[PDB]
Amino acid sequence: ESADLRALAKHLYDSYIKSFPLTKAKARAILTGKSPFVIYDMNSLMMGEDKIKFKHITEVAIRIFQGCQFRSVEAVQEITEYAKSIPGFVNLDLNDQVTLLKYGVHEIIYTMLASLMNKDGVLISEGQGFMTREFLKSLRKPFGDFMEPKFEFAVKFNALELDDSDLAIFIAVIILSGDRPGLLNVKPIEDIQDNLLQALELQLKLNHPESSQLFAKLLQKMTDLRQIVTEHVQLLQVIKKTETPLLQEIYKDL
Amino acid sequence: NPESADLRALAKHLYDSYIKSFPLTKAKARAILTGKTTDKSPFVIYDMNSLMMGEDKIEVAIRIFQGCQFRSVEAVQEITEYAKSIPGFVNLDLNDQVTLLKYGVHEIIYTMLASLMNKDGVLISEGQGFMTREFLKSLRKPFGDFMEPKFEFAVKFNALELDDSDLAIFIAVIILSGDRPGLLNVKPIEDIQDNLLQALELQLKLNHPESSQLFAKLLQKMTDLRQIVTEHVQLLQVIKKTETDMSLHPLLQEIYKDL
Numbered sequence: 001e002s003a004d005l006r007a008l009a010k011h012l013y014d015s016y017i018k019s020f021p022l023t024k025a026k027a028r029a030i031l032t033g034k035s036p037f038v039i040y041d042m043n044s045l046m047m048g049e050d051k052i053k054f055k056h057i058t059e060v061a062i063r064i065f066q067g068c069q070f071r072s073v074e075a076v077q078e079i080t081e082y083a084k085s086i087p088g089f090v091n092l093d094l095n096d097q098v099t100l101l102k103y104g105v106h107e108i109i110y111t112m113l114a115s116l117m118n119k120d121g122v123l124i125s126e127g128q129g130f131m132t133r134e135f136l137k138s139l140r141k142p143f144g145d146f147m148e149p150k151f152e153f154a155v156k157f158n159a160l161e162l163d164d165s166d167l168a169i170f171i172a173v174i175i176l177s178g179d180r181p182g183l184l185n186v187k188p189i190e191d192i193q194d195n196l197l198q199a200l201e202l203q204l205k206l207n208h209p210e211s212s213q214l215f216a217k218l219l220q221k222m223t224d225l226r227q228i229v230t231e232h233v234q235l236l237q238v239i240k241k242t243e244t245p246l247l248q249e250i251y252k253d254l
Numbered sequence: 255n256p257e258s259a260d261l262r263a264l265a266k267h268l269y270d271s272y273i274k275s276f277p278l279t280k281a282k283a284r285a286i287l288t289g290k291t292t293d294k295s296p297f298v299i300y301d302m303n304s305l306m307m308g309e310d311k312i313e314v315a316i317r318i319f320q321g322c323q324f325r326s327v328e329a330v331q332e333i334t335e336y337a338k339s340i341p342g343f344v345n346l347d348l349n350d351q352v353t354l355l356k357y358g359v360h361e362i363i364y365t366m367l368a369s370l371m372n373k374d375g376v377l378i379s380e381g382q383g384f385m386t387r388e389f390l391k392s393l394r395k396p397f398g399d400f401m402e403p404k405f406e407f408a409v410k411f412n413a414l415e416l417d418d419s420d421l422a423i424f425i426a427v428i429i430l431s432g433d434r435p436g437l438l439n440v441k442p443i444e445d446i447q448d449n450l451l452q453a454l455e456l457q458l459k460l461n462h463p464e465s466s467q468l469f470a471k472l473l474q475k476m477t478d479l480r481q482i483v484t485e486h487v488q489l490l491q492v493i494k495k496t497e498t499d500m501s502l503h504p505l506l507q508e509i510y511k512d513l
């Protein structure tokens with residue numbers, strides 16, 4: 001039966017590679033050596049907009065935030081395509097699929113955002129750029145407190161040294177959360193998630209044999225994820241109290 | 255089935271997103287309009303007393319017009335949700351996304367409005383109601399002329415007998431139009447629409463194997479869609495002068511601006 005867990009792990013890894021262009025191995029190779037444009041202050045931001053091809057350009061902090069929402073929309077679509085590859089997901093109730101995605105995209109977005117972050121900054125524009133953590137902190141309030149929680153999460157999460165094949169199953173586990181509010185049929189969701197959790201346990205034990213309870217710690221990280229999301233939507237409504245048409249319909253979330 | 259399987263997967267994806275984005279599909283509209291139910295029967299509005307009676311379970315011409323406006327805003331929200339699910343759409347330039355929605359939203363609105371129509375009237379309020387064509391024609395000028403072109407187009411267009419799986423790809427093709435005014439990068443939009451047109455051609459061949467050249471006729475209906483949108487914006491340009499005390503919805507204002 002363990003061969004079946006390995007088959008599921010390989011399937012999810014292949015789908016993960018198909019769905020996410022900027023993998024953690026690529027981002028890690030860019031952050032060490034293999035040449036992204038670094039944005040460290042306002043002038044390097046200017047030259048970045050004049051040199052890098054950004055798609056969100058129609059105050060500076062509002063612009064940075066709006067780009068980080070463009071990327072979030074793209075991410076939601078990639079996560080949707082990946083979720084459709086999880087065995088049993090498409091056979092679920094359609095409303096349940098919509099609910100699972102609706103409540104999972106944020107936790108997955110920050111999980112994978114950790115893959116593009118180190119203690120000093122975050123990759124941007126499919127790895128073409130690297131915006132420093134200090135330049136993000138230097139943004140005016142409340143926009144200066146948006147990314148620091150994500151950095152603090154990414155340090156501890158990256159300390160687990162997970163690879164893409166681990167993150168594929170971990171993300172698949174996040175999607176199939178049977179406690180999302182409004183679900184109509186929880187039984188098949190929790191069944192799929194139990195199979196995915198078995199696959200994740202076997203994967204972590206075969207891929208990290210020196211880490212005794214890495215599975216448990218990875219499960220413990222999900223509480224931190226829900227804290228980052230829960231405390232992020234607060235900054236999102238306060239952000240709705242600091243920014244006063246057709247563009248706002250595209251970004252009714254993020 | 256070589257690369258046809260990729261187009262079939264794209265069709266299934268678009269149909270799934272379609273069902274997830276529009277709560278009143280054509281299938282449910284036809285189940286309501288015909289007689290497949292005793293639970294899906296609508297309340298029929300055809301005069302003043304049936305309107306006043308039907309205002310329990312969800313000026314007069316102004317009220318109906320505002321209802322059409324609210325339904326239009328809701329439709330723009332649903333079409334936006336569906337557009338974000340078109341592969342490659344959210345990867346385009348943001349300005350081009352705004353433009354594509356801006357010029358495609360009403361063509362899609364009337365296309366799907368055909369699904370809620372017969373020759374006698376149109377479903378309203380999620381199918382709970384059904385307002386007749388002649389009651390809409392009886393409204394004061396020029397509100398009485400607002401819906402007739404939509405009814406004529408819907409009569410000609412419903413003859414193609416498309417189901418929801420066809421309409422998903424068709425409205426996807428409508429969104430990814432490279433001839434919209436003001437687009438920055440036409441080439442990617444045209445690549446996506448080339449893929450969507452392949453998917454639509456295959457879907458119409460497999461779903462309607464007896465409908466000869468249904469692809470061409472469906473593509474030709476976009477002319478009628480264009481003419482309908484133009485006549486509507488002209489009517490609006492009259493209403494803006496006759497009714498100085500009425501307001502168009504801000505989203506609708508931004509849509510119609512420089513159309």
Ligand SMILES: COc1ccc2nc(COc3ccc(CC4SC(=O)NC4=O)cc3)n(C)c2c1
Nearest residue numbers: 317318319321322323325326363376378379385
């Ligand atoms: C209160 O009674 C109601 C309630 C809702 C109804 N919906 C419809 C028909 O649905 C329509 C018709 C036209 C449009 C296009 C329009 S109209 C406008 O002002 N701006 C647009 O973009 C969009 C939806 N009718 C007849 C209604 C009657």
